[PDB]
Amino acid sequence: HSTAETTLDSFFSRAGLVGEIDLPLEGTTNPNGYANWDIDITGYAQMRRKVELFTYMRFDAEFTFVACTPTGQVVPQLLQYMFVPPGAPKPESRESLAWQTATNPSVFVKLTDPPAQVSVPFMSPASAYQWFYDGYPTFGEHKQEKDLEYGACPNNMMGTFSVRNVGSSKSKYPLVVRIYMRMKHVRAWIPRPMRNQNYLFKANPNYAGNSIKPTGTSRTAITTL
Amino acid sequence: HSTAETTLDSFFSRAGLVGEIDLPLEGTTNPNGYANWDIDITGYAQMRRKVELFTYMRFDAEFTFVACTPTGQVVPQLLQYMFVPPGAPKPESRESLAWQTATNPSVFVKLTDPPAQVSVPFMSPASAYQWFYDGYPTFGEHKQEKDLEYGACPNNMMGTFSVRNVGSSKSKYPLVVRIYMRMKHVRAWIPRPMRNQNYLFKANPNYAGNSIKPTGTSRTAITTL
Amino acid sequence: DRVAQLTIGNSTITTQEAANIIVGYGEWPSYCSDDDATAVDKPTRPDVSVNRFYTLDTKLWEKSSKGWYWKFPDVLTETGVFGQNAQFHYLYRSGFCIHVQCNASKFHQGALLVAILPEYVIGTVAGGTGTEDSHPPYKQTQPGADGFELQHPYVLDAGIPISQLTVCPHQWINLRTNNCATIIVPYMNTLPFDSALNHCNFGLLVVPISPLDFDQGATPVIPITITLAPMCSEFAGLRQAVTQ
Amino acid sequence: DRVAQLTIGNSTITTQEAANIIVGYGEWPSYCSDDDATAVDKPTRPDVSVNRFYTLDTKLWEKSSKGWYWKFPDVLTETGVFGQNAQFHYLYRSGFCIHVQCNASKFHQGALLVAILPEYVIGTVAGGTGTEDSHPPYKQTQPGADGFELQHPYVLDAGIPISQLTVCPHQWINLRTNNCATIIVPYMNTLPFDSALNHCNFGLLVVPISPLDFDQGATPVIPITITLAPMCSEFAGLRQAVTQ
Amino acid sequence: GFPTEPKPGTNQFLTTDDGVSAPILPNFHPTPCIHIPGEVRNLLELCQVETILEVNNVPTNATSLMERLRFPVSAQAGKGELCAVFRADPGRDGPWQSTMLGQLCGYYTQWSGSLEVTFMFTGSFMATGKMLIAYTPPGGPLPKDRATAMLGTHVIWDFGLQSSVTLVIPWISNTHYRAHARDGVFDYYTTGLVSIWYQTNYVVPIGAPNTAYIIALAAAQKNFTMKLCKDTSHILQTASIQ
Amino acid sequence: GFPTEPKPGTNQFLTTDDGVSAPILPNFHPTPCIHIPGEVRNLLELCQVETILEVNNVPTNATSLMERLRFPVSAQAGKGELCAVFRADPGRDGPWQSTMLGQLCGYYTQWSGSLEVTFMFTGSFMATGKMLIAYTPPGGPLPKDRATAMLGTHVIWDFGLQSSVTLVIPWISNTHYRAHARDGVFDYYTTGLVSIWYQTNYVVPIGAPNTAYIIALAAAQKNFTMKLCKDTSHILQTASIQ
Amino acid sequence: GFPTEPKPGTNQFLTTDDGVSAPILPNFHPTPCIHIPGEVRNLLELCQV
């Protein structure tokens, strides 16, 4: 019996949803034809629980962007995706000058074309990404107001992902962009207990203290099935 | 730690905006369905500042033409791009005879096709392009009226880039063509101080004498951060 | 094999009821390679003055105790010459030899799980309901030498099962078998050096899985003492002493 | 190493407080290859009559001086046999040995930055506001042997920082150390030959970075003299003498 | 151009397809990989590490959760009384859910191999006793008494200096692999039942506690294997994670 | 034709993608490349060339810009007075912005390596003096006095025939690379502080100036490296360039 | 099919592009080339007359 399907690559090299961006016509969520998604794969439970089985992880990845309207309808619209590394100017509008991408990598696709796919390397200044960082990013007094920074490691903050309608006028259709990630060439260190409770937030392991459920199923008596 | 990302090719081999052509329906800017862009990568600050770090530069390039309407909308329109080397007849209208391209290189694309891309060699009669030419192109008296020619080197004037609606009637849509340039096989000589002030014009290093700002940030005292 | 002696620096530990020695992840502490390093300044390797056994506070094992934990670079930052170097230098690096000791009698019973959990991040009960994004105070994330007591050991105060804590370098102190646990930990971090003040490489957990018990008349005070020694300590980036 | 002698042609320069010699871009002047050339006519290589030291005007260093500059092929076009050849021939080519000299006393102080800036294009203040596209007059772009004074040395009258001017072949004259600067420049241009009248291959900049100072009583007149010698001069394309 | 002919499957996005994708950063070079302790190469490395088995999965009270980690043993009446019972099924709802093995199983449809359960006695040094841990292969109903349980695979455990004993649940299956067993039809893949009985009795002197606890730790053997990845039965999330 | 299947990324225009493009001029041959002096092969060649460091970045006046290029030193009271201070951070707003190194850094997200600052005394030949240039690694607050500054990396400079002295700011970091340091969280990547103090005093005879200036020149060492290209923080343009 | 990705310049007709084109007459063989006087190989041959 082969042990090949339990290698790290077999386990993690499967694309899963990690991001979802909305570009509606009318609303309070990115209604100006552009959006800035903070790159963080910690927003969805399935993908998150798997990677959080290990403390550190080094890997290249393959990102696929599936775009369409909220009904799943494919529309003849041209979009522009741009990777904005930390420090680069984040677009403030659909006609922002930042869309010139003289140096940032950008992808131009129509929703009628098959989902855009691209390869990304391991771009952390650390030797691996940390799903858990037990510490603070800066020195000084750590008062109540700044406890927001506990567990925040900049070595995991890879930047922003920006999207827009390639134009100067409002789009004729409402859009949605789902982001999938497939890990390749994976190295992993230090396994940990698997998530036990429901996830509540992105930057931390908070759990609902009043709804602490058992790891699994329960029964009436220990002497009866 | 590798020193590969600081080679000239790594630094310059990144496409950036160097030209922008408008083909509106009604207006005073190329309203007859055609345009003649004078090939000069000195019209945009980002790309210009980088190359002006060196005095001389020899390189091949890859030009990409991204076309669409002013709203970013992709329209079913057929365009014709033509490279008109200096000396060749520049088109005077959409139906000009020059569009026969019996010898000039031309590209026919629809806005629905992916952006046209093409390779260009080093076509200067000099051994390299000069971002700076401290002299005049012709002999004779150099009076006030002709100071317009100071710093103008013909070895950098590669010709014109012409665009048109492949037709004999007005187009049904307003168009815009953005030109991107990626340098390849780069050689560079004699580094210079990097642009300090805002750019004002193309053919020269003029700066606003009343708004001469410091190279960088300032502070209150030299003994305090 | 039941008896052992650990000598390092000018300190020696003895034991006659040990249960072998665990070497975390099968690796002995070592100094930083010339190719794994970045800081260009020559580090200080004080040796014998810092690589020795330091005995921290003692805890009392009660029939109702939940368990305690200690963050490691931390527990020593205000003790001996190790602490001074950790305060004067920006960068620190080192492994540890942890020796938890607790003895009773042939009539007492109970079992302690002694484990090492790298990057032991503490979570909060989130106001009970789970709607309040509260965070653990400095006094709890870095308790110092006095350690800190677990409020919800079942989830290690971090939403993870203690039943799986054995995937980490650990050892048990079963009173009917041994009276101490010895674990040797190498330097573990994603960086060759790091701050001994802002970062805690791992946490030491001592938790009663099988409650302490005995009949009235047998001595009721059963202490648990923690002794630990740095190994292959290196410091760099000298400046003035910083407490935090 | 502090003493030196430069002999070329029928001229000799002496110095007892030098600071070595700089060879621009690590290359000595040389003649044009048979594969780098295009002009088919046989060139003239007058040698000793043109490759010698010519001493141009002297400038006075004041406690308030801003700095001066000289365009090079130019400074010599109306002097000696070099000038005659530069006027009679269309094409010219050559390197230069520039020796800037300025002495004071052990009680004077100050520092001059002597640098070579290839293709030194001059800009204007654009009418102050920056809305007027004005251009530098012939008298300023090609000042001749009298050189020209900088109005805004900080930006080298060309919108570029002088603080970075050291990426060019340069040398300093620090009165407490040396009393002269020697720089040897090879022929630099994108063409094998060019006009000595229309084009100026480079510019010589002499700028006070540390102001001259001394106590009243010490001689107040501190001159800065420029001496320069062409090297490997070649001319071609003979015709009548042209001044400009 | 070169004559081609796209087939079905064109443009589809298969989650598990392992293909090539355009790189976003040309000539980018990742941070060197330092040496880090505890590197994992295969998940089976984790399935062999023993983790606490919640045999006493009865208490659900808020304050009594820590006691599911161990079960009691005490002085009896000497008639081979039953102590505890549990299914040997790894990927089934029950005691094994608290183990790392049980958790990793949740990610695979099928498994194969022997399992092992180590029982550690945490009584006092003066406490003595002998237990009979029995494993009843499939088909055998929960043994009513010790005389029935002892007819299957078992081990008589004697408390002493060596605090623990290991019950090996040998791989005794009809099929090469077992899918996760559930109630109903999939009970076809049941592994069997484990039951602890008093071989003799828990004996103790005056002055020593009359009740002690046992902690069960479970893991897999070297011949254990898993195949066909799937998602765990549970998703730890109710509403969007903020 | 040959069965193909386009993947995501199709038709996208990635600015940094290094691919092939159709040539516009068939059989075209470029002008031969003559030999030209001063050819650059790598930008690190420029990071090692010293350029004037504006330590005295105080004057903003129109007529006083040239004096940011040098700072004063003069006869004191002999109590180890402070002369000047500045952050050693290369890609941070401040003195280093006037240097070529600081400018090239602006084009890269991260850097690594030792830096060096050479101080040239431009006083008179008769002027004497000893200074103490100190470098305070991270965490160390701006030293209040010389007795505190001397506890870090430093060099006592003696004025003499050799006009200059070099303070080497050794690479003392926790991380292999440093991203540009800014106020706030990214102050994590600060390099430290440099401060010049009077070791003894600026002494001079009668007839010689009581005030002289020092010019600081800065560059990188041979172990300096940069990675991850980005655009400089500033764009020298306000409106369209005509 | 084999994964491809068309780049800019697709469909354009460059007058001077030297590529391959489908032949209209399969197995067609041209009339043999007799020997003819005054054959030119390079235009520079004419610039010298």
mmCIF file of C-alpha atoms in Angstrom, chain E residues 5-172:
data_model
loop_
_atom_site.group_PDB
_atom_site.id
_atom_site.type_symbol
_atom_site.label_atom_id
_atom_site.label_comp_id
_atom_site.label_asym_id
_atom_site.label_seq_id
_atom_site.Cartn_x
_atom_site.Cartn_y
_atom_site.Cartn_z
ATOM 1 C CA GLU E 5 -8.244 20.278 -31.345
ATOM 2 C CA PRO E 6 -9.409 21.134 -27.754
ATOM 3 C CA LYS E 7 -11.149 18.271 -25.919
ATOM 4 C CA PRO E 8 -13.777 18.143 -23.147
ATOM 5 C CA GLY E 9 -12.402 19.520 -19.889
ATOM 6 C CA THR E 10 -11.270 22.662 -21.667
ATOM 7 C CA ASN E 11 -11.445 25.754 -19.429
ATOM 8 C CA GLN E 12 -12.535 23.733 -16.383
ATOM 9 C CA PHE E 13 -10.977 24.490 -13.021
ATOM 10 C CA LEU E 14 -10.210 21.242 -11.229
ATOM 11 C CA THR E 15 -9.315 21.942 -7.609
ATOM 12 C CA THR E 16 -6.811 19.078 -7.441
ATOM 13 C CA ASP E 17 -5.304 19.443 -10.918
ATOM 14 C CA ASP E 18 -1.522 19.768 -10.657
ATOM 15 C CA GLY E 19 -0.481 21.971 -13.551
ATOM 16 C CA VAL E 20 1.768 24.910 -14.358
ATOM 17 C CA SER E 21 0.788 28.565 -13.832
ATOM 18 C CA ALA E 22 2.375 31.826 -14.968
ATOM 19 C CA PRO E 23 4.753 33.230 -12.315
ATOM 20 C CA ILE E 24 3.883 36.715 -11.085
ATOM 21 C CA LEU E 25 7.407 37.733 -10.095
ATOM 22 C CA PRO E 26 10.175 37.180 -12.670
ATOM 23 C CA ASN E 27 13.628 36.379 -11.295
ATOM 24 C CA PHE E 28 12.347 36.488 -7.723
ATOM 25 C CA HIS E 29 14.472 34.509 -5.246
ATOM 26 C CA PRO E 30 13.015 33.344 -1.885
ATOM 27 C CA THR E 31 14.593 33.880 1.514
ATOM 28 C CA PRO E 32 17.116 31.073 2.179
ATOM 29 C CA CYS E 33 15.761 28.235 4.284
ATOM 30 C CA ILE E 34 17.456 28.109 7.689
ATOM 31 C CA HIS E 35 17.514 24.823 9.562
ATOM 32 C CA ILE E 36 14.402 24.391 11.692
ATOM 33 C CA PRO E 37 13.798 21.547 14.174
ATOM 34 C CA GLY E 38 10.847 19.183 13.895
ATOM 35 C CA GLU E 39 10.360 19.051 10.140
ATOM 36 C CA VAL E 40 7.551 16.761 8.968
ATOM 37 C CA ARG E 41 7.849 14.770 5.729
ATOM 38 C CA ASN E 42 4.772 12.525 5.879
ATOM 39 C CA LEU E 43 1.581 12.660 7.982
ATOM 40 C CA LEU E 44 2.058 9.025 8.981
ATOM 41 C CA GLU E 45 4.860 10.303 11.204
ATOM 42 C CA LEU E 46 2.129 11.927 13.317
ATOM 43 C CA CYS E 47 -0.202 8.933 13.311
ATOM 44 C CA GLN E 48 2.440 7.020 15.260
ATOM 45 C CA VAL E 49 2.630 9.555 18.098
ATOM 46 C CA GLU E 50 0.367 8.611 20.998
ATOM 47 C CA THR E 51 -2.215 11.155 22.099
ATOM 48 C CA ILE E 52 -4.731 10.859 24.939
ATOM 49 C CA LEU E 53 -7.755 8.718 24.091
ATOM 50 C CA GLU E 54 -10.955 9.955 25.747
ATOM 51 C CA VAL E 55 -12.358 6.581 26.812
ATOM 52 C CA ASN E 56 -14.388 8.358 29.493
ATOM 53 C CA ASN E 57 -16.289 10.550 27.028
ATOM 54 C CA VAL E 58 -19.218 10.952 29.410
ATOM 55 C CA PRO E 59 -18.859 14.300 31.298
ATOM 56 C CA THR E 60 -20.055 17.245 29.188
ATOM 57 C CA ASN E 61 -20.324 19.658 32.112
ATOM 58 C CA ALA E 62 -18.271 22.863 31.757
ATOM 59 C CA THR E 63 -16.129 22.106 34.832
ATOM 60 C CA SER E 64 -15.840 18.371 34.178
ATOM 61 C CA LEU E 65 -14.244 18.349 30.717
ATOM 62 C CA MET E 66 -10.779 17.537 32.026
ATOM 63 C CA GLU E 67 -12.010 14.237 33.408
ATOM 64 C CA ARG E 68 -12.773 12.688 30.045
ATOM 65 C CA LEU E 69 -9.018 12.278 29.758
ATOM 66 C CA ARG E 70 -8.904 9.454 32.312
ATOM 67 C CA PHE E 71 -11.132 6.694 33.691
ATOM 68 C CA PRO E 72 -11.406 5.239 37.242
ATOM 69 C CA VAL E 73 -10.439 1.882 38.690
ATOM 70 C CA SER E 74 -11.028 0.849 42.315
ATOM 71 C CA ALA E 75 -11.436 -1.944 44.863
ATOM 72 C CA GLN E 76 -14.240 -4.275 43.760
ATOM 73 C CA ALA E 77 -16.092 -7.417 44.895
ATOM 74 C CA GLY E 78 -13.899 -9.873 42.950
ATOM 75 C CA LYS E 79 -16.200 -11.198 40.238
ATOM 76 C CA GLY E 80 -14.311 -10.022 37.166
ATOM 77 C CA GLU E 81 -16.275 -6.773 36.962
ATOM 78 C CA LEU E 82 -16.327 -4.681 33.798
ATOM 79 C CA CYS E 83 -14.285 -1.490 33.928
ATOM 80 C CA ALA E 84 -14.677 0.304 30.585
ATOM 81 C CA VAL E 85 -15.660 -0.318 26.974
ATOM 82 C CA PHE E 86 -15.197 1.395 23.606
ATOM 83 C CA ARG E 87 -15.159 0.762 19.847
ATOM 84 C CA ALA E 88 -11.736 0.343 18.268
ATOM 85 C CA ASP E 89 -12.853 2.312 15.191
ATOM 86 C CA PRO E 90 -10.364 5.234 14.614
ATOM 87 C CA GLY E 91 -12.390 7.454 12.291
ATOM 88 C CA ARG E 92 -15.692 6.988 14.088
ATOM 89 C CA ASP E 93 -17.488 9.301 16.513
ATOM 90 C CA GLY E 94 -16.406 8.396 20.021
ATOM 91 C CA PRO E 95 -13.209 8.202 22.144
ATOM 92 C CA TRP E 96 -10.791 8.246 19.200
ATOM 93 C CA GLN E 97 -11.937 11.740 18.227
ATOM 94 C CA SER E 98 -9.676 13.196 20.898
ATOM 95 C CA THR E 99 -6.567 11.644 19.347
ATOM 96 C CA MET E 100 -4.302 13.035 16.625
ATOM 97 C CA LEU E 101 -4.731 9.768 14.747
ATOM 98 C CA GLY E 102 -8.499 10.118 14.808
ATOM 99 C CA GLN E 103 -8.192 13.691 13.612
ATOM 100 C CA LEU E 104 -5.858 12.907 10.711
ATOM 101 C CA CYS E 105 -8.098 9.998 9.730
ATOM 102 C CA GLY E 106 -10.916 12.489 9.249
ATOM 103 C CA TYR E 107 -8.953 13.776 6.262
ATOM 104 C CA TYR E 108 -8.781 10.383 4.543
ATOM 105 C CA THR E 109 -11.539 8.111 3.293
ATOM 106 C CA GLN E 110 -9.714 4.839 3.938
ATOM 107 C CA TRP E 111 -7.107 3.428 6.304
ATOM 108 C CA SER E 112 -5.313 0.139 6.907
ATOM 109 C CA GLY E 113 -3.031 -1.231 9.590
ATOM 110 C CA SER E 114 -2.715 -2.236 13.216
ATOM 111 C CA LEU E 115 -3.505 0.198 16.008
ATOM 112 C CA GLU E 116 -2.180 0.313 19.534
ATOM 113 C CA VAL E 117 -3.497 1.627 22.833
ATOM 114 C CA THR E 118 -1.223 2.163 25.815
ATOM 115 C CA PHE E 119 -2.791 2.314 29.269
ATOM 116 C CA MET E 120 -0.935 4.140 32.024
ATOM 117 C CA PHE E 121 -1.902 3.459 35.644
ATOM 118 C CA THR E 122 -1.687 6.603 37.770
ATOM 119 C CA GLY E 123 -2.537 5.093 41.139
ATOM 120 C CA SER E 124 -0.126 5.058 44.079
ATOM 121 C CA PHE E 125 3.025 2.956 44.408
ATOM 122 C CA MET E 126 1.319 0.774 47.022
ATOM 123 C CA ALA E 127 -1.635 -0.036 44.755
ATOM 124 C CA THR E 128 -1.588 -3.407 42.982
ATOM 125 C CA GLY E 129 -3.859 -5.098 40.476
ATOM 126 C CA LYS E 130 -4.280 -7.082 37.277
ATOM 127 C CA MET E 131 -6.591 -6.111 34.429
ATOM 128 C CA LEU E 132 -7.610 -7.932 31.269
ATOM 129 C CA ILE E 133 -7.815 -5.716 28.177
ATOM 130 C CA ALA E 134 -9.587 -7.565 25.379
ATOM 131 C CA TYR E 135 -10.109 -6.825 21.696
ATOM 132 C CA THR E 136 -13.132 -8.448 20.058
ATOM 133 C CA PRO E 137 -12.906 -8.711 16.244
ATOM 134 C CA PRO E 138 -15.973 -7.916 14.068
ATOM 135 C CA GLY E 139 -19.193 -9.841 14.555
ATOM 136 C CA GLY E 140 -18.547 -10.407 18.226
ATOM 137 C CA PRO E 141 -21.216 -8.564 20.247
ATOM 138 C CA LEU E 142 -20.090 -6.631 23.316
ATOM 139 C CA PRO E 143 -18.894 -9.459 25.611
ATOM 140 C CA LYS E 144 -21.344 -9.868 28.492
ATOM 141 C CA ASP E 145 -18.675 -11.102 30.919
ATOM 142 C CA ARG E 146 -14.910 -11.606 31.228
ATOM 143 C CA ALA E 147 -15.202 -15.298 30.367
ATOM 144 C CA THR E 148 -16.505 -14.219 26.959
ATOM 145 C CA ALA E 149 -14.141 -11.304 26.409
ATOM 146 C CA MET E 150 -11.083 -13.455 27.067
ATOM 147 C CA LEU E 151 -11.919 -15.564 24.003
ATOM 148 C CA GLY E 152 -10.629 -12.820 21.722
ATOM 149 C CA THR E 153 -7.303 -11.026 21.401
ATOM 150 C CA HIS E 154 -6.245 -9.865 24.847
ATOM 151 C CA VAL E 155 -3.517 -9.049 27.341
ATOM 152 C CA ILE E 156 -3.417 -9.488 31.122
ATOM 153 C CA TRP E 157 -1.895 -6.318 32.600
ATOM 154 C CA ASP E 158 -0.023 -6.414 35.915
ATOM 155 C CA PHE E 159 0.523 -3.088 37.720
ATOM 156 C CA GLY E 160 4.130 -2.577 38.775
ATOM 157 C CA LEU E 161 7.268 -0.485 38.279
ATOM 158 C CA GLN E 162 6.423 -0.323 34.565
ATOM 159 C CA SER E 163 3.308 1.835 34.828
ATOM 160 C CA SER E 164 1.953 1.162 31.339
ATOM 161 C CA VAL E 165 0.948 -1.750 29.115
ATOM 162 C CA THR E 166 0.208 -1.794 25.394
ATOM 163 C CA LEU E 167 -2.800 -3.459 23.838
ATOM 164 C CA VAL E 168 -2.107 -4.016 20.173
ATOM 165 C CA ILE E 169 -5.256 -4.049 18.057
ATOM 166 C CA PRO E 170 -3.909 -6.179 15.195
ATOM 167 C CA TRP E 171 -5.159 -5.502 11.701
ATOM 168 C CA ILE E 172 -7.796 -8.201 11.366
#
